[PDB]
């Protein structure tokens with residue numbers, strides 16, 4: 001069958017100030033034809049808590065086989081306590097499993113210039129939770145994308161439209177073993 005991959009993300013998955021069809025999850029959907037459906041449920045600026053609030057309706061609506069969780073970066077960019085982000089992500093993972101879906105957790109990291117003790121503590125939540133729940137820990141693309149000015153919006157913060165096909169292709173490669181086309 002054609003399973004659904006739900007992406008529960010922030011602007012890194014929604015695409016910042018662009019059409020939904022331009023963002024990498026839509027490009028991935030198109031690449032996969034109808035082998036697997038990709039539903040992007042991502043909103044620019046969402047905290048992990050905001051994503052968690054949206055999740056139950058999405059699980060009921062979409063009944064996904066897998067849920068790619070790409071959240072917590074906004075919490076970290078706002079200097080929220082790591083334990084709160086950890087706990088919120090923990091709840092998301094519990095809810096995804098309890099809906100008979102497989103969570104996939106994307107590592108998030110803050111930029112090299114961010115406060116270092118804080119950034120280490122923030123980034124450590126992701127391998128911790130992936131081990132705790134025994135779920136896939138997906139790699140994070142943003143630092144590589146930021147190396148290409150031609151893939152970044154004028155702020156040097158958000159990937160642009162031209163980045164999206166590259167991200168889609170890379171994500172397709174990371175997700176190949178999971179969807180087993």
Ligand SMILES: CCCCCCCC(=O)O
Pocket residue numbers: 010011012016043044045046073074077108109110111142
């Ligand atoms: C550096 C951590 C990743 C942050 C991405 C979220 C930005 C936004 O949602 O507008």
